[PDB]
Amino acid sequence: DDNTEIIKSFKNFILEFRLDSQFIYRDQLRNNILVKNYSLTVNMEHLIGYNEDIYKKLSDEPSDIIPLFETAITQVAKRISILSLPTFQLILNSNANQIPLRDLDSEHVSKIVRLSGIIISTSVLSSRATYLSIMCRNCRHTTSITINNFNSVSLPRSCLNCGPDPYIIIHESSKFIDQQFLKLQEIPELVPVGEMPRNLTMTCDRYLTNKVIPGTRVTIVGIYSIYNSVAIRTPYIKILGIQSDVETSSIWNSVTMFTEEEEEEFLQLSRNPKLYEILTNSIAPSIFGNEDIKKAIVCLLMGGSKKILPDGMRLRGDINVLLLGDPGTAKSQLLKFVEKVSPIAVYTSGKGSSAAGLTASVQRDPMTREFYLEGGAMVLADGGVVCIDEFDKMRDEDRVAIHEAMEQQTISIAKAGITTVLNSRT
Amino acid sequence: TSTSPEQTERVFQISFFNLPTVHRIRDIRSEKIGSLLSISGTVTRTSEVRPELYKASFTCDMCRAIVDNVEQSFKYTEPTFCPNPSCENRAFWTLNVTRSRFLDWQKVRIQENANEIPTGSMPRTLDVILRGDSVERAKPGDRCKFTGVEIVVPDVTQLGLPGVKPSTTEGLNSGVTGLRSLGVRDLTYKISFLACHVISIGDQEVFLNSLS
Amino acid sequence: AADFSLTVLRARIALLATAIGGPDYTSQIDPPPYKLGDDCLACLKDLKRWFKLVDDQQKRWDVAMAVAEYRILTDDLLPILIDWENKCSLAAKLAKNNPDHEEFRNKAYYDKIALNCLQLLVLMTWPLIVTEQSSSNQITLYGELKKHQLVYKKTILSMESGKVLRAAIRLALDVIKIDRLSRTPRDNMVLKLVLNFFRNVIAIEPGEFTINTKKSMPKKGITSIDTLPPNVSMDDISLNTVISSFHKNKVFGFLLTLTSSLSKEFDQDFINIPLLEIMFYFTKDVNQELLFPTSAGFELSKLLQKEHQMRKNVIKHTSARHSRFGGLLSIQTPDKTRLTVSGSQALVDEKIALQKLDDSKKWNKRIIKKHQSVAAEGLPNSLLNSQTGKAIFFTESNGKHFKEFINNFIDSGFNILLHSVTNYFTTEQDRMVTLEQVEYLLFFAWFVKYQLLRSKIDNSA
Amino acid sequence: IDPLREELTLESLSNVKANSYSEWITQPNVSRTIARELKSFLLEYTDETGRSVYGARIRTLGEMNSESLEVNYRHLAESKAILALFLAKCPEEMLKIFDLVAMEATELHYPDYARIHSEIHVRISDFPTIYSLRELRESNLSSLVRVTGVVTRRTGVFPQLKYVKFNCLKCGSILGPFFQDSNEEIRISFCTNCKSKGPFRVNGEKTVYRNYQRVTLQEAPGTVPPGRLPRHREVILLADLVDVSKPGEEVEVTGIYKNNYDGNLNAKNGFPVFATIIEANSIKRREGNTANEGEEGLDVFSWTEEEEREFRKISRDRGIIDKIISSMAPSIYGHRDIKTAVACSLFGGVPKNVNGKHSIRGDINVLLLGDPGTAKSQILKYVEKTAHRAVFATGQGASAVGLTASVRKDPITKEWTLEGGALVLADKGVCLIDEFDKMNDQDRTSIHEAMEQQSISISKAGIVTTLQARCSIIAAANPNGGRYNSTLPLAQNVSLTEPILSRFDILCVVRDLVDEEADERLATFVVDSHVRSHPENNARQRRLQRQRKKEEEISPIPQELLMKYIHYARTKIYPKLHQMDMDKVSRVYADLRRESISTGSFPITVRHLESILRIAESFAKMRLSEFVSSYDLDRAIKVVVDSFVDAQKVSVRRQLRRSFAIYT
DNA sequence: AGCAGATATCACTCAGCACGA
DNA sequence: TCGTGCTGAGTGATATCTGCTTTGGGTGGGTGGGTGGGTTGAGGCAAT
């Protein structure tokens, strides 16, 4: 009844929106379908402009309204692509005020919120159920279930005599999707007085997976929901859209993501006869002098080229710089600026560091009783720069662990039955 | 100032002392269970003070009837029969804390003195329970002389507890069975001590008043 | 509807209770003296009107439960009566000092308040009887009201060492102060009220434990049969406490005076039956042998020896070794068939073997017992249902006082009381209810047997 | 007249006619009377000044969009003794009625406040009786208690169901919502309609959630008997109370002592023993506030509007800075150079972030290098008392990770976790390190990053994180050999290295010299102070008046008012520099560098120019001024130049003082 | 598979009356 | 006042069906506990 009307309203919004003479979402959906990208990104300002009632309905009960929007998108896609296709995904963009991660409480339960933080951990992709094929043990009755991933579903308790829970899933006829778990910490500047940073559990589906790497600031739009692991519920965030300032896709792939307008801006800048002076002046504008150190930092950021010989020998292509000087030289400020400007960077204190901190650590899983390897500053800062302040303060033991990382750009671990050679190109 | 509505009957406690004989922890036997005797030992550990249910009061779920003065054994106890002729409720009760009575409770762990210990032997240990005013009268490390009654403590787990799933000697410690409660289970016993007396062997105007 | 009306009833009675009066904390004298409210007499009259128009005419008992909930009795009526009695005692002392000296104002109003308080006390303390025709509300509130009555009796016997008994005695003596011919029906009604108050105070006792029988009893079974309130023990309501209070407040003297001048200076029609009921409730649970027996140590030693002999006889059935020793016996029947028994006593003895064989059997033949609840007929607990040997444990002083009281009554007015009761009852035999028949017969039997025993013990009486 | 709407009077309310306090309070008429009396108390209560305290409190509550009205227990006790007794004996229902009557006094001022916060909580501030976790017994059950302890363990904030809705498995009927106790679970056994033994699936169309948190309160080391194991209790923090107490802090907890049935407890002990908890009503941060226990209120550093007006009036005075300096440690005779530095450190500077790329520290560090008996530890103790957040540490008593942050394995989750330290606890506060020179090298070196970057970096056991440490450090040290040698340079008198010395903004060298006049004056002042503090030398009002009279002798400003003033200035004032003599500061810096070129001299770097600017900002802040004036800059220049001159040797001190006479 | 709780359908005891002795 | 059924509904009782849960291991959790078991390896910390 009402669901059909909501779906019709969403379909009309998709098929009728236009700001000048291009149907933005219709054309976007067609283009996405062309390249086998079953999704659609919707700007919430446009939804508010088209009809405020639709936005009110979406905001009131997101977990119950979003699936209807996905169904409408799927129907419109079928109309536009097939001449008489899994369920499409809805990705939202908004400009609402960002709520501090610590300000999330009971008042924000089951609502769309926007917040920013730092990703500290990502999980291995799991498998969720969308279309389940089931059969009854006794009478062998074939049945199907369609499941949406939004949680306010189970196998029928009663067959359609058969005992409780008589249905068994047939796997070869079912369809699954991808799922991932992320841990989001709060920005250091936003932490309250004398408090440890807070962690938040988050989940992403399908096309929002494999979008972020640990240690990168991101902005998240999602639903502040709760799940029962007796009078309490564990909070979590259902991601609806990820916005980051670092092109992670272009970093972990040889593929490079840059708009044509970008590529041509970076060529024009490179054509500048004196780009070297511009970049030298662009580093630590608030620090006087130290021109040579600024040039060295520019060279370190740019880095060299790495060659792999036919015999297998590999030549390093990263540049390391040491600053030994008197107090008040502004070395720490330069290190902080380098950490801020580099696409990937980790700022660490020698004093407050360890051998296992800076390479990788053997960690036992509490449940499985199995040993895994976590990563340290030189694995988290792979492909970037590691700013080791207070280098002199570092213990010998700790220090000695850095040699292979610096030169061979690898980490060798032989502990608790784990024999592996990690990659640390920093 | 005002009338106090809560004035319950006093819970008198009788404390004995000056027993002719003082026993050691190694001298405790099962023939003296339920007898008044004194023991001496060194306090090892002291638990915190807890409220212990003494005389419970319950209200009927159905008809709101009230059942009072339900004596409690080592386990939690509830009524079985509603006092209302009309009411059929048997096994549906809710505890009422307002009308219930609680007592102070503390667990003290003691071990035999070093001089009494046979050479090259592990010290022997015993559990002493203090109630009422005798609470927090023994501190760890002290050498105390307790006077009280030797008791035997069952396995309350076996007996059946609300919301609790039930469950040296190489399996030779087999308990007693045959009880209705213990349909297929067995009951084991533990020797403890209930002490009623504790003796620890080991501004101008206020001061003047104290002196004789 | 019903629940809302119950809430309104409770609220209105609570307002009445708060409006009756309370202690005056302004005065520095401690303990504070009770102060009467502006409309104390009106409040008592309204409470009596509520009792008449709701409790009885509508066949319910919600008013009594509401009154008990807000402690109207233990906090208002008993202090009022005690204070009035103390004022009268002070006036008597002043008169002794100087007969013309007086320290009373509004004496009529105080007497009116005291009389209304005594009437309400009798109303609240009247025996509770459940019949077959009793409404559902009456049936459902039986146990709670009995518990409240127990609390009332304990408070009456304890507070101020029971001075309300002295207040009632003074009220009765006020009627006694006027001649028999000058005695108006109101005075006789007051006398009957006082006697009924005493009878009710003696009569009250714990009720029965009523259990629904719809369903066969569970695997858990009966836990305990306890009807006592939370903060009331059997020591507070026992006949020992009643004897102590009566001796302290000289109730026995008043009763003896009434029963000695019976049918001579009084109208017997009003007084004969209340006296008979009072004495029956006095002596219904008392065995006469106990009254004619440190000696406690000697008896304790004898009982310990008896238990020792019983334990010695029990010992032959116990095995010296532990249970798991595991001795197996085979016993041969007259025909060549062997039966198996377990236990050392089985091997060492044959009678024990056959007893164990018998005992081991699982099948039981059904035994049906015809049990009649005494509360069904409205009778109180007495010798008829009390288990044989149930002994009322008196203290030495209380036992002496009770024996002296009974002896004085038997030597003073038992003859006249029996004659008057027999005349009145044979004149009105058919109207007898079961309670009156049982009461008369038990009183006659008890007193005759006690006199027989005392005559045997003592050659004088 | 409807009987349910009739009400009694106060004297009649005192007379109890029920079997228990809860039954008396729950009665309709009694509840109405209690609510009316509480409303009257809130509306009509007046202090010595004569203005409605709670009217202003409600105004402030509405202004700040808060949901907690603080009520002082003493005020209620004096105004309405019976209501205070009821609150003490039956906290639950009394607090419910008090909460209701508070949203009708708030709503009186702000009619539409219900659209901001649905409910308002009442918090009791000063309960007369204080208990220890050892002293708790069964007689305190279901009654308000006040206990102190250490927050050993903490949980994350969880949403808890305010109301629980049940539906029959079989029948399908949905039972009405039920109140969720904070203590233990609510279950339905007997169905009103269905009458089914079977359980109910728990479902609800719409549920209202509540903030929930639990902490492990432990006896503080100070209060526990020496050498005995501490006792602990579990404290439950409901909505608006969460995150107020942080692990490792010392707090006073006002709450309800409650007990519940625990099966495992019974099982383990073998006796019918009930578990116990505390339902927090109010929390007071006792950390570093041992000497401030004589005040009232949940927060002694908070201020009212009238106190803000008084602060403004005080600030408008010309000689405010001199009075503030004189009020620092009034019991210490002289050392007007150690008091000025302490005041500057307490007020602090303004941190700056230029274009989001450059971060500049805005805190002032002070070091006291002096003789054994020159009143340094007492100064540190006074700073600890006055500062809003302070931490005290000793030389060898402090480890390299006891300061800063440390890594442990979590007992519950069996995973590596991060703990705070001295520095962390002193965020936006002060860290005091007595016996600085006796510190281990390793220990000492720890604070290097923290003292300038205002951040802590940890890379241990797979934990890669950066914390915030915006704490100022004031340290006391003894010169090498136990006594300063004024002939040798400063560097030879101490074992500290150049970086640590440079990180200190102000250096105060204290010398003990024999002088007849100085000795006479110091002895006279010490004797007078000792006589003044002799214990023998309304009742509460009389005590306060005599204390004020004693204080007036040695301090021009009340100490509590001084702490409130410092907190207000730090929180609400951020001075800026717009007009200033560039050439003067540049020349001063150049001259300082030229004179410091000498070997063994006190190090000079850009850090000290920034310290001059910071001290100017602090001096401007001392007057609650929004802009730094030329006088403040001149005073800061004089302070720094005087410290530098005093740090020199005897032989060249005269020449240095003559050269720098222009600036000072 | 075994165990504990429960439903419901299975008999048996005291109850009492008609005939005659 | 014995003997022999016929009536009988009450008061049982015992022969008979309806729902957990378990082992131990994270394919039940950490608002069931760590004194009911698991448990050897790595890691960080303080006293040394």
Ligand SMILES: Nc1ncnc2c1ncn2[C@@H]1O[C@H](COP(=O)(O)OP(=O)(O)OP(=O)(O)O)[C@@H](O)[C@H]1O
């Ligand atoms: N040339 C400069 N321009 C601007 N600011 C400077 C310059 N030199 C030093 N500073 C300031 O001096 C202070 C020195 O602190 P910083 O932590 O940067 O020093 P550092 O060289 O790392 O020394 P250390 O070895 O003592 O840690 C910083 O506030 C920095 O802003």
Ligand SMILES: Nc1ncnc2c1ncn2[C@@H]1O[C@H](COP(=O)(O)OP(=O)(O)O)[C@@H](O)[C@H]1O
């Ligand atoms: N200038 C002073 N004014 C008042 N009292 C002082 C002064 N200097 C020292 N004292 C007294 O002498 C003692 C000095 O001890 P303390 O300062 O704690 O030692 P340290 O200086 O090594 O920390 C204090 O108790 C203090 O009362």
Ligand SMILES: [Mg+2]
């Ligand atoms: Mg540095």
Ligand SMILES: [Mg+2]
């Ligand atoms: Mg010192």
Ligand SMILES: [Zn+2]
């Ligand atoms: Zn089926």
Ligand SMILES: [Zn+2]
């Ligand atoms: Zn019932």
Ligand SMILES: [Zn+2]
């Ligand atoms: Zn139902």
